Design a protein around this ligand. Structure first.
Ligand code: HEM
Ligand code: HEM
Ligand code: HEM
Ligand code: HEM
Ligand code: CL
Ligand code: CL
Ligand code: NA
Lengths: 106, 106, 107, 105
C-alpha cells in the first residue's frame, strides 16, 4: 500500500529511506543512507539540487515544500519515471530535516 | 535523527510506519496503517491524543512541534517505555500530515 | 498563584529539572536542557555573568531576586527574547544547594 | 530524573513532575488540586495539615532543609520507603513548598 518516503538532512544527505522507497528506487536503505538525495534524479536536476536546498535555507521561500510537483525520478538501474513529490520540513535536536513522499505515477 | 518514524494524517491516522518503528512498537506497517496513532500510547494520553491534534489545528500553537518531548510509549505487548518525540507538520495533496521521529530512551 | 514553567538548577547553574511548561516557553526539551547551564536561557551579558551571580550569592547570602522575584528578559532556543517574571527559591538536598525557578511569560 | 512536587501553604498540590506521576501513580492533572496528604498513609495523612500549619506559625523546621526517610503511598494504595527533601519559597507573600522525592525501592 504505502508510497515511498525519504528523509534528508539540511544538506541533502539521505537519513531514512522507506521500504517502498527501496522497491521504487532500487537502492537498499543502507545504500541510500549517507548519499546525497540528488542520486534519485536525472540531469539537470541532479546537478542543481544542492543549490535548491541552499536557496531555501537562505530565503525560506518555498517552491515545492507544502506545494508539491510532478517531476522525473531515476532508479538505481538508471531508468527514469514520472512521480509526484510532496515535501515537509521539521526540526529535530535543533537541526532541519526534510521529509519527502513520492507517488509513482506509472 | 532517530531511525523510528511515523507519519499521521490530520485525524491521527497512521499513514506510514518505518521499519524501526515496527520493531520498537511491535506493530507491522501493514497492520499499523489506518489505525489511530493513539494505539501506541498508554492512558491518559491515549484517550486525549485526538484532542491534542484538533487543538493544534485550531490554535496553531505548538506544545511539542519544533520543541520535542519525552513521553511514555506502549508496545503491542502492553509494555511501556520512555521515548523522545520530535514532531513536524507538512502538507500533501492539500491536507496536513504530521511527521514523528521516535527515540527509544530505554 | 505560581507559574507552571519551573526550572531546577544545582549550585553551579546546571539545569536538573525542566518542566513541561518551561520546555514550551523556552523551546528546549528536557532531554537537551538537562545538564546545560541555565544561562543558555538568557541574553548577553546576563548569560556570561549568571554563574558569578550564583557563586557570589552562595558566598554572601545576600539575596537580590530570591524571595522577591523580578521581571527579566529571557531567550528562547530559536533566539527570540521575551519579558518574563522570575520567582526564585533556594533549598537543600543531601547537603547541597538547589534553586527552584518559576517563570511567567509576559509576552 | 527525580520526582518533584510543589504545594501551596495549605498543602494543595500545584505542580507534579513526570517522575512524580510515575512514582505515585497519579497523573499530573489528577494530583494538582488535591492535598499532598493523599500521598501518604495514616497516621501522617491525617496529621500533615497540622505540620504545615505548625511550621507557618513557628517557623521551626523539621524536614525543610533537613530531609527524612518516610513512607509514601501510591495511587493504588501500596506503600513504599522514600527520602524527602523540602524547600520553601515565597511569591505574593504566600509560601510554596518544593519537595524532592527519592524512591528507596
Ligand atoms: C528524486 C526526485 C527529486 C527531484 C526531481 C527534485 C527536484 C527539485 C527541484 C526541481 C527543486 C526546485 C524547485 C524550483 O526552484 O522550482 C527542489 C527543491 C527542493 N527539494 Fe527536491 N527533488 C527530488 C527529491 C527530493 C526529496 C526526496 C527531498 C526531501 C526528502 C527533496 C528536498 C528538496 C528541498 C528541501 C528543496 C528546497 C525547498 C523548496 O524549494 O521548496 N527533494 N527539488
Ligand atoms: C506514541 C506516543 C505519543 C504520545 C504519548 C504523545 C503525546 C502527546 C501529547 C502529551 C501531546 C500534547 C502536549 C500537551 O498537551 O502538553 C501531543 C500532541 C501532538 N501529537 Fe503526540 N504523542 C505520541 C505520538 C505521536 C506521534 C508519533 C505523532 C505524529 C506522527 C503525534 C502527533 C501529535 C501532534 C500533531 C500533536 C499536536 C501538536 C503540538 O501540540 O505540538 N504524536 N502528543
Ligand atoms: C532565564 C532567565 C534568567 C535571567 C535573565 C536571570 C537573571 C539574573 C540576574 C540579573 C541575577 C542577579 C540579580 C542582581 O544581582 O541584581 C540573577 C541571580 C540569580 N539567579 Fe537568575 N536569571 C534567570 C534565570 C534563573 C533561573 C531559572 C534560576 C533558578 C532555577 C536562577 C537562579 C539564580 C540565582 C540562585 C541567583 C543569585 C540569587 C539572588 O540574586 O537572589 N536564575 N539572575
Ligand atoms: C508523601 C509523603 C510525605 C510524608 C510521609 C510527609 C511527612 C511529614 C512529617 C512527618 C512532617 C512533620 C515533621 C515533624 O514534625 O517531625 C511533615 C511536615 C511537612 N511537610 Fe511533609 N510529608 C510528605 C510529603 C510532603 C511533600 C511532597 C511536601 C511539599 C512539597 C511536604 C511539605 C511539608 C511541610 C511544608 C512540612 C512542615 C515543614 C517542616 O516541619 O519542616 N510534605 N511532613
Ligand atoms: Cl535533604
Ligand atoms: Cl540525603
Ligand atoms: Na486535579
Amino acid at each position: 500500500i504505502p508510497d515511498a518516503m525519504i528523509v534528508i538532512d539540511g544538506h541533502g544527505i539521505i537519513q531514512l529511506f522507506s521500504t517502498a522507497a527501496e522497491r521504487l528506487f532500487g537502492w537498499s536503505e543502507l545504500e541510500a543512507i549517507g548519499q546525497n538525495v540528488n542520486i534519485l534524479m536525472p540531469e539537470p536536476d541532479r546537478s542543481r539540487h544542492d543549490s535548491y536546498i541552499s536557496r531555501y535555507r537562505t530565503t525560506s521561500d518555498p517552491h515545492i515544500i507544502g506545494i508539491g510537483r510532478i517531476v522525473t525520478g531515476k532508479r538505481r538501474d538508471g531508468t527514469t519515471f514520472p512521480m509526484h513529490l510532496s515535501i515537509g520540513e521539521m526540526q529535530s535536536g535543533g537541526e532541519p530535516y526534510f521529509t519527502g513522499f513520492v507517488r509513482d505515477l506509472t
